[PDB]
DNA sequence: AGGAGGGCGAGGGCGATGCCACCTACGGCAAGCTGACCCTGAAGTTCATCTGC
């Protein structure tokens, strides 16, 4: 009963329209965002943050839930299309390079293989 | 010598023993700090030791 009531309403918030995950997703709170044209060149990096004194990581965005990394190798795993910014630019600010280069370097190749698939 | 040393019954009868108004007035009754120090996690990897080849 523990979680058995978590799934029960669950299935109806996910059927009465309360905006909540569908399959693999997850209301993750992205805080700045990446914008783009069709071909890449980077536009403009814009912040869906200011809410509450305490500033949190933006807004609450429907997007793929993380597949869980953790590891000492956690380059390796890498989620989807929204990650770390270690993981899209490269960029570590306490981790340094190489542990930060290789978690790109797999965002890329997963980036690169679900645009194959 | 023999005496008799008071018989008697009244000793408070009357009423007030507090009249007032106070019994506090002031303002303080916290000021300063702590209220946690460390760990031990999810999850994957990594090294020297357990064992068979």
Known sequence: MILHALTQYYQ????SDGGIA???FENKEIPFIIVIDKQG????LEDT????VKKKVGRTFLVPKGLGRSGSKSYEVSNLLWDHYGYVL???GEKGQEQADKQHASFTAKVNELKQA
């Open 90 to 92: 490269a960029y570590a």
């Open 12 to 15: 109806r918030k996910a059927e």
């Open 22 to 24: 569908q399959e693999g």
């Open 49 to 52: 943050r200011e809410l509450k």
């Open 41 to 44: 060149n980077f536009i403009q």
